[PDB]
């Protein structure tokens, strides 16, 4: 510390006195994050763990909102042939927010999977389903042969083979009137120039992949000018402990020590504050217990030494820091040979001004030589 003191004063020789050299702080250990106990997820089981779905033309619409979405299960079970997202994460669906979701459940053909795509052209992409040029959502399609194919043929499902105009994005057509491909009015008669717009698939277990039935769910997410109903740590953010660390509590990133506080707070629990508008206590989302926040070490390091003449040894004073925390007060990386002696070891005194290292406490009382403070003075005399 003598050399550091010399540099601060820009002199090779120093006189008796106490000089404030530098400042020390304790950095956060690794990290900390906390959030609520999570609740029941959105009813995705009824979407993927169900029994029967709807037809391609009569695709069923569900409004998913006011619930927590646990999207991990979508990719955890790799039983789905097609799982593709556009405008949204496929994998980190648990770290995204959206006001509302629309689930479109239906059944298509294997060959028609190519038709089902954003801004695509095809029979299904025109007469049964359509997506916009700025689609924001996921499409999950998986073969449903054993689930949606009869031995003789599952003809229940239907698809709109004919339609005058292509469907607009997010549009459904459930018209059952006889389609007219000519100028001859049908007048309620089906035949020449008059055919049913909906035709039935020959879904059979023996049919090929192209002709086999595939259950498809399209989840379109919208985030309009309203608070998001799907937000937060879907899976988990826990396993924290009390220590001088940087903590992320429900949006506040703050460095401090999360101790335990014996204070009674209001039933509905949220953040805390003090007179100076500085946070001093934050809630524990999981357990109904309050935690204080305080600065780690602050303080400053000063060097106490007589003049370079007649003596060379020096002592260190750390201001307003417990003598137990001195070893980690900006250390473990400095010059090991000649810094640990002045930061650890014997000759440690806890005074009102802080911690003194390198000075031996004596019960006598002489005239003040170097004023440490609070009635404590340091002298080089034996």
């Amino acid at each position, epitope marked *: 510390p003598l050399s550091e003191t010399k540099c601060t004063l820009k002199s090779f020789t120093v006189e008796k006195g106490i000089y404030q050299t530098s400042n020390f702080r304790v950095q956060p250990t690794e990290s900390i994050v906390r959030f609520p106990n999570i609740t029941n997820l959105c009813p995705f089981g009824e979407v993927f763990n169900a029994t029967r779905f709807a037809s391609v033309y009569a695709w069923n619409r569900k409004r998913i909102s006011n619930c927590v979405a646990d999207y991990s299960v979508l990719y955890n079970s790799a039983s789905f042939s097609t799982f593709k*997202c556009y405008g*949204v994460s496929p994998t980190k669906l648990n770290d995204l927010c959206f006001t509302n979701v629309y689930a479109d459940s239906f059944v298509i053909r294997g060959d028609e999977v190519r038709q089902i795509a954003p801004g695509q052209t095809g029979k299904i992409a025109d007469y049964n389903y359509k997506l916009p040029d700025d689609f924001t959502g996921c499409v999950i399609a998986w073969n449903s042969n054993n689930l949606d194919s009869k031995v003789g043929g599952n003809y229940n499902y239907l698809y709109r083979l004919f339609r005058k105009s292509n469907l607009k994005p997010f549009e459904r057509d459930i018209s059952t009137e006889i389609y007219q491909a000519g100028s001859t009015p049908c007048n309620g008669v089906e035949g020449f120039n008059c055919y049913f717009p909906l035709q039935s698939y020959g879904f059979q277990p023996t049919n090929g992949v192209g002709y086999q039935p595939y259950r498809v769910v399209v989840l379109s997410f919208e985030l309009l000018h309203a608070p998001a109903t799907v937000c937060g740590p879907k899976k988990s953010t826990n396993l924290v402990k009390n220590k001088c660390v940087n903590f992320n509590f429900n949006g506040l990133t703050g460095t401090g020590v999360l101790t335990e506080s014996n204070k009674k707070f209001l039933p509905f629990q949220q953040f805390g504050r003090d007179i100076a508008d500085t946070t001093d206590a934050v809630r524990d989302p999981q357990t109904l217990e309050i935690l204080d926040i305080t600065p780690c070490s602050f303080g400053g390091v000063s060097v106490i030494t007589p003049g370079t003449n007649t003596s060379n040894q020096v002592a260190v004073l750390y201001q307003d820091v417990n003598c137990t925390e001195v070893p980690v007060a900006i250390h473990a990386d400095q010059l090991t040979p000649t810094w640990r002696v002045y930061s650890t070891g014997s000759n440690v005194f806890q005074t009102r001004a802080g911690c003194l290292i390198g000075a031996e406490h004596v019960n006598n009382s002489y005239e003040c030589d170097i004023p440490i403070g609070a009635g404590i003075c340091a002298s080089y005399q034996t």
Partner: nanobody
Amino acid sequence: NSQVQLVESGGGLVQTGGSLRLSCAASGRTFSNYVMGWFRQAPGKEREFVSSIEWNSENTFYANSVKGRFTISRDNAKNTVYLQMNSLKAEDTAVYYCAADRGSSYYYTRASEYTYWGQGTQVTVS
């Protein structure tokens, strides 16, 4: 014009640890709006993710055993994608397929996260 047909080329024999390039050409709709993905499949094996590049050419992603060694880039004006093999390994002997999927600029790894599939080009590493 409306169908994104993809054709792979450039695959061939190359020394292990050397340099090589594979070109996937896309013809049809606007390629600039299509995320691009390169996968590998060994003879008689399954398709494994190799690399992915975004539609807007913002970030690139790679699998566990191919990150860093391989690079991916794309040109929208040329409607082409170039995958550069650097520091190749003998395990890279397989058919590389190139796929276009109209997605956003986020991570895309799983084969199920892609719609189209190219013819594929055979690459051999000794």
